[PDB]
């Protein structure tokens, strides 16, 4: 057979109490399609973090799920112009491959300041920071190669960032910065996992790297819940925080490895090390050339 990659939590039984065949699985699970030869259900079983085996059953196919989703909603305050085009996840192929370095990290969501602080100062010999790049001026205090890589050039540096040697960049106070493919690179090598401050839009140059990062998304489950994880911040800033987030999974699903939701930020903190722990290897998860 081959593998798949869910990309949205799917369970019949819970969500009408019809009783089945049907596996359930949540976002992130990797299973294992054993005949998909059906246009409407495959057979599969899920990928355990240790026995394959389990439960052989059935998952809608990308055909019925993507029938389903657009059958839902949508003249409505219609402009004329073209809408967000449609767009339904399902599944993604993937393959088993062997990496010989730390994956670099990236968490994203409500309080992934603190989730980054904390495994960096909890865990100094397994989780650090890469050193960016930026064209401002070298100040008294600061060391080149320590606290940025100096770069005399902005000519120079435009031309890297146009030649995507940078996972991520931007300009601030008239200067560019930006964390290069090299920078983290040095640090996966060294069997360090790379924490990243970066945008959900780096995972696909990183995976173009061959360095493979685990991103983590932290979901809110609403306003409310905000509140819970992160009670050091105004209900004020707590209603964008969580509009953010919305945003950011609708636009940047695909590109999670996984999603972590809880009561507290405790535990959060502890499901984000629990999933670093199941991602990091040797043996990954990967996206596969072969095509639904």
Same mark, same amino acid.
Request: charged letters at 30%; proline letters at 3%.
């Given at each position: 057979?081959?593998?798949?990659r869910a990309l949205?939590d ?9 009783? #089945?065949?049907?596996?359930?699985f949540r976002f992130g699970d990797v ?9 409407? !259900? !495959? ?7 240790? #026995?394959?085996? $389990? /439960?052989?059953?059935?998952?809608? #196919? ?8 657009? %059958? +839902?909603?949508? !003249?409505? %305050? ?43 100062? &909890? ?30 050039? +902005?000519?120079?540096?435009?031309? $890297? ?35 990243? /401050? ?25 306003? &409310? ?17 969580? /509009? ?12 999670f490895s996984a999603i ?15 999933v670093?722990?199941?991602l ?5 998860w ?7």
């Amino acid at each position: 057979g081959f593998y798949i990659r869910a990309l949205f939590d799917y369970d019949k039984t819970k969500d009408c109490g019809f009783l #089945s065949q049907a596996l359930s699985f949540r976002f992130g699970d990797v299973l294992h399609v054993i005949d998909a030869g059906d246009e409407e !259900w !495959w057979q599969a079983r899920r990928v355990h973090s240790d #026995s394959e085996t $389990d /439960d052989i059953g059935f998952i809608p #196919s990308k055909r019925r799920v993507e029938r389903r989703e657009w %059958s +839902r909603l949508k !003249w409505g %305050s219609s402009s004329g112009s073209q809408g967000r085009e449609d767009s339904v996840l399902s599944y993604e192929t993937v393959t088993q491959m062997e990496v010989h370095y730390a994956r670099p990290i990236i968490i994203l969501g409500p309080t992934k300041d603190r989730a980054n602080d904390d495994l960096l100062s &909890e865990f100094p010999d397994k989780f650090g920071s890469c050193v960016p790049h930026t064209t401002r001026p070298k100040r008294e205090y600061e060391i080149d190669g320590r606290d940025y890589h100096f770069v005399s050039s +902005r000519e120079k540096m435009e031309k $890297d960032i146009q030649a995507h040697k940078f996972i991520e960049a931007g300009q601030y106070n008239s200067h560019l910065y930006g964390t290069s493919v090299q920078s983290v690179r040095e640090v996966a090598e060294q069997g360090k996992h790379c924490i990243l /401050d970066v945008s959900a839009n780096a995972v696909r140059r990183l995976q173009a790297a061959h360095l493979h990062p685990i991103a983590i998304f932290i979901r809110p489950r609403s306003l &409310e819940n905000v509140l819970e994880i992160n009670k050091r911040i105004t209900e004020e800033q707590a209603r964008k925080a969580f /509009d953010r987030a919305t945003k950011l999974e609708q636009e940047f699903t695909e590109c999670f490895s996984a999603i972590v939701e809880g009561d507290s930020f405790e535990e959060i903190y502890h499901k984000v090390k629990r999933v670093i722990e199941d991602l990091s290897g040797p043996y990954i998860w990967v996206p596969a050339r072969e095509r639904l």
